[PDB]
Design an enzyme around this catalytic site. Structure first.
Site, PDB file in Angstrom:
ATOM      1  N   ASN A  13      95.243  52.139 -20.448  1.00  0.00           N
ATOM      2  CA  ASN A  13      95.310  51.796 -21.874  1.00  0.00           C
ATOM      3  C   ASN A  13      95.111  50.313 -22.249  1.00  0.00           C
ATOM      4  O   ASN A  13      96.045  49.519 -22.437  1.00  0.00           O
ATOM      5  CB  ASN A  13      96.585  52.340 -22.527  1.00  0.00           C
ATOM      6  CG  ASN A  13      96.552  52.195 -24.049  1.00  0.00           C
ATOM      7  OD1 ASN A  13      95.503  51.912 -24.628  1.00  0.00           O
ATOM      8  ND2 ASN A  13      97.678  52.411 -24.694  1.00  0.00           N
ATOM      9  N   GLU A  68      86.440  52.560 -21.921  1.00  0.00           N
ATOM     10  CA  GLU A  68      87.029  53.102 -23.131  1.00  0.00           C
ATOM     11  C   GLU A  68      87.080  52.022 -24.207  1.00  0.00           C
ATOM     12  O   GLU A  68      86.783  50.834 -23.964  1.00  0.00           O
ATOM     13  CB  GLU A  68      88.517  53.574 -22.875  1.00  0.00           C
ATOM     14  CG  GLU A  68      88.731  54.787 -22.028  1.00  0.00           C
ATOM     15  CD  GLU A  68      90.189  55.160 -21.809  1.00  0.00           C
ATOM     16  OE1 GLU A  68      91.118  54.439 -22.237  1.00  0.00           O
ATOM     17  OE2 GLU A  68      90.404  56.210 -21.100  1.00  0.00           O
ATOM     18  N   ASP A  86      98.411  53.855 -28.644  1.00  0.00           N
ATOM     19  CA  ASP A  86      97.173  53.129 -28.904  1.00  0.00           C
ATOM     20  C   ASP A  86      97.295  52.406 -30.268  1.00  0.00           C
ATOM     21  O   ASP A  86      97.569  53.075 -31.238  1.00  0.00           O
ATOM     22  CB  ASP A  86      96.023  54.115 -29.018  1.00  0.00           C
ATOM     23  CG  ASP A  86      95.751  54.905 -27.765  1.00  0.00           C
ATOM     24  OD1 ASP A  86      96.041  54.426 -26.653  1.00  0.00           O
ATOM     25  OD2 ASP A  86      95.274  56.050 -27.934  1.00  0.00           O
TER      26      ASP A  86
END
Lengths: 302, 302, 302, 302, 302
Positions: free
Chosen positions: E242, E187, E15
């Protein structure tokens, strides 16, 4: 039936009726049981009568009919209806859900005696059945201008109204009961005539707020009715499933008489002695619809 | 949670439940604390029971369940629900917001004993979570015609209703809790069946006037519900965040039983002795919608 | 003015305010005169304080401010507003329609002392005038997240709201008062913030029914407000031109606190001792509008 | 038939099924032939099983059923369906287009034995015919909450779905097969229940793009279905006419399990060892529709 | 929860976060486990940093934070967020779904040390709950022009965004978390400001195609947002749940930095050494909406 006695019972209230005779207004009330505030020896199932000539001073006449003493078949006398005809007084009554009787007197204050061996109207009177859960106890009797008497009765449903012709002797029926309908009909079928029109008034059910006294109008006594509205809302009405009422003309004015503990409390007395019985003056519009009901606050001037 | 105990607490009121058995109507009420008019030594947290065979004469059976004596895990017993099955009586209860229990007796009047080491339903029962600020204390248990028992429960939001299957032994759950929705749902989830249809009744919230007892209908027990309206408005309802109720058939008639100090005061007694518990007769329209609820004024004739 | 004292006077009622500090909820009330039931030696014009840590057990702290003893210029102290800032408590008050003061303490329970030689806000504070028949007595003070404090005030008309910045010392004003508008604004301007939005709540006038506590929302503290509705109708509200209120968060829940003799009577006590002060829990919808206010019936569990 | 074996054959792919038992997720796959990359001695027509307790570490159980050894009548075992009932495991399978069988074990890992002398379901099972070019090989078996088991099956057309009741012994049929319809139905009829609703999922045909896994919802198991949409598009899906899938709840979460070489390649392993079998977590909307399917990237934390 | 770790886990990805300092662009990435191509001894759970002054030549700074060595309470450090304030660097991180931390350094390249005894933000931080299946691991911290810092966080639902104020010391929270909503929020909540407007960017869910990086705009930091569209579709995006990203201004240009193996493969290197981290230049329309993102193909000329 039977089964619905817990809601239709008039045992703990007073049902009123009224007639005018010889310059006086007579008010009749049923009594059954059992008022014990703390405590009490209080009772006696019957119909009593009070009268006035001025709407402020009342004379108590006491008991005028007791079903146990004064009929051959009945034990209770709810929901009186009173008519003067043939120089006699006819007092119709409900034996507790078990048949409708008639008692007769030469006097407005009795003694009234039911001459019949059984109910004048009952479940097997022709035209009553079929009915879905109808109640039989609260007659409204009316004598039309043509000399035809009618008894209106029934309970517990829009289509549970009946009306049957009475003989001119007022102690017999003629033909079969007929059916009527009124929106939300609950109890207390009542008929009066004014200015050529027929007024079917009644207690409505609990389906859209409290039960109220409501009415329909027609140019005929048993058909052609159109719902017109509420006579008496009574904020807040209830206690105790009792919108039994009379509508009577006295000394040129129209009055609605009804039983209501709450309303009577916000007003004063107990008619030395009868309830809880309220008297309002009723007014009509030019078209015959009911304009208003106004609380009486005083008696007649003369 | 917890956090909302100041509004969901049943500590100072009585939550009713009802079952019919062997010709009698049994009414159960929770009690917790603490009524001191001026002053008082008044208490004892438990469920009590009264019964009748006529809706006018009541027998007091007293305490039938006390969580501290009669369970292994609970200290409080709010919001009873009672079912008769398997020749036994199952009394479900809320431990004060900390789990739902079940107690069992061979008699409608106890003694009831909770056989389980912990709550039958609790926060970690599968399917309960996730929930936003749901309350767990007031079960409504219903046994369908197919033999499937269900417990409805939840509080504090339109989507905060749960329903879980119970085993046939009535002291176990089967599978996960399912979710339901009802407009303005507050408390007091309740299920009864009439004429092939399922009636989800409940206490509504305070978002549009006072809390009322309202309902939905479906042809299935846990899905397909459509909101139908208000059963009981109760002018003016409140005091004390308590629209816990039962809907029961007795001797061919349907009744709603509910707790309301104000309404009971405008009516009379204290059911020698239980509250404040009002009983109205309920009627249905031909389409199954609820027509009306009518105050009872008398008992059964026979 | 002056001229409207007969309707704006808070002399015979109690105006509440609230703050949370060190785990406790403090409730402040103004008192002025003159309650003599039959008869009475009853008085003492001041502000008093009670507190709790559980919403059921209350500690009386008594008088915390008396304008005659604790200010140099004022004789009356209506309509408190309380803020905790700078490790100090600031108690704003109305001198009977003749100026708004501020008193300061190191303790929530006083003694509070007004340090100023005259009112903090008065008729000649810049930006107050022009106004048509505005009343100056009931401040609502709020400290925004950016450190800007504001005092909202005004009375008697949709456009008679004012808001002025306070200095960080909380005992001075900065710049001119600004104007705001709210439908039917009467009294009791109040500001709280929740979830990024500003809630201007107030007592409405008597132009469409009784005065109620109503509100607007904005994303800014002094502009951009849109009317949202009624917080508290209170059937039937009145007695005595007093919808002064507080809205406070305590232990993760939101509460509205208000004075209402009638409502308190239908609920129980007198907060050993303070009124007549009712506490309801407040809930929000997802969009930030107020969902409902629910009567508290019990205290916190822990 | 027969004739369409070139397109319905499962010979060179793996069809998955899943059950949860004693804390573990078991995945079953059919195998038939004949993978020779360059070159290979690779085979053995059967069903194998792997399991996990964490979705990251897998135990291989190997072969659990081989039609030639473990049935009296079948030679192939495609398209497993697995149910746990009666303390036993029932593994339904397709004999290569020539009948549907059932094999039984006391263990989730076998050995499974088909007790019947012939197929449980076949072309002459009542209610199957008439059908236009229907395929019989891929059962989906489901046990409803009422104890009724059903087998869904069929292929190659919107109206070519069948569903038949199974006896409680799970090795017999009851009554006739019933018909169902689903838009663009191709293969892989599957039923699961969640939150009171029934989910008929299936592989769609090639009439509007690639075959996808799509679904319908109902409040009943065999009627009332309404098409809702695509569960899994799989860009670009194909290879090899195989959208056989399972939908299972495990440790409070819902998962879709499906076979897809392409997708598995863009993700990693071969489940030491089983394919090519992908597992995504499935989420529902409040209304019960499927919100999304999300690729798993890790195992359970505990 | 917990339960959704298989889909929210950042264990096998990186990340990114970014800050500009003293003429250089610093890129931070989380690392956790476990890349073994065939085979490998590969690991070490931490955050690393690379920098550039030209977007083509990169200096590796290696590990700057290791939760096990550099915090008292955490074991994992996913999803960095980096801010420069008070002559210090604040590096926020997610302990694997179990709380959000903060680590501090005097240098952009560490060593960073978390000074707190526990998480800065966690499940019991006021205002976080109630939430339905929210994830807590990926903070986006932003310092507004007024000096108010905010941390945005949350996961797994349109209404599962939270934002809380941070103290000026950047290692404490002030007040309660607030809620926000964004269509299809999954997210990676992120905030940046440009030309007086606030840009809430985020990873969307899988409900309508692949997860994408999408955004909303407002004139305020925590309210008033309106959805504007997709920043980065990334054909075909996925692998591995992601869309963590940064948006930063460097040398007068705006850049979006994101992790994407597939995209990086169609472009070239591994930032000697960090991923898989792609950098595109971002352009705005005159109205502030995002015009386009363009792949960088070269470094700065000077």
């Amino acid at each position: 039936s039977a089964a619905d006695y817990p809601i239709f019972s008039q045992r703990f209230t007073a049902d009123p009726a009224a007639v005018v005779y010889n310059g006086r207004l007579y008010i009749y009330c049923s009594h059954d049981s059992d008022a014990t505030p703390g405590q009490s020896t209080y009772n006696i199932p019957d119909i009593t009568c009070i009268s006035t000539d001025d709407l402020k001073n009342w004379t108590d006449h006491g008991e005028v009919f007791n079903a146990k003493r004064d009929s051959r078949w009945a034990s209770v006398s709810w929901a009186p209806s009173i008519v003067y005809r043939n120089n006699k007084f006819y007092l119709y009554y409900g034996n507790g859900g078990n048949g409708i009787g008639v008692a007769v007197s030469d006097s407005p204050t009795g003694p009234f005696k039911d001459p019949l061996p059984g109910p004048l109207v009952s479940w097997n009177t022709p035209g009553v059945q079929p009915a879905q859960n109808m109640w039989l106890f609260d007659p409204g009797v009316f004598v039309d201008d043509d000399g035809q008497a009618y008894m209106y009765f029934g309970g517990n449903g829009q289509n549970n109204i009946r009306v049957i012709k009475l003989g001119n002797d007022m102690i017999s029926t003629v033909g079969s009961a007929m059916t009527m309908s009124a929106p939300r009909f609950f109890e207390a079928a009542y008929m009066h005539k004014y200015n050529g029109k027929y007024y079917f008034s009644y207690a409505s059910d609990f389906s859209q707020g409290a039960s109220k006294i409501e009415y329909m109008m027609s140019d005929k006594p048993t058909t052609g009715f159109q719902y017109k509205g509420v006579i008496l809302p009574q904020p807040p009405d209830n206690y105790s499933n009792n919108n039994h009422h009379a509508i009577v003309e006295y000394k040129g004015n129209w009055y609605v008489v009804y039983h209501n503990r709450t309303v009577a409390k916000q007003r004063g007395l107990d008619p030395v002695y009868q309830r809880n019985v309220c008297i309002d003056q009723m007014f009509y519009n030019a078209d015959g619809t009911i304009k208003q009901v106004v609380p009486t606050v005083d008696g007649l001037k003369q």
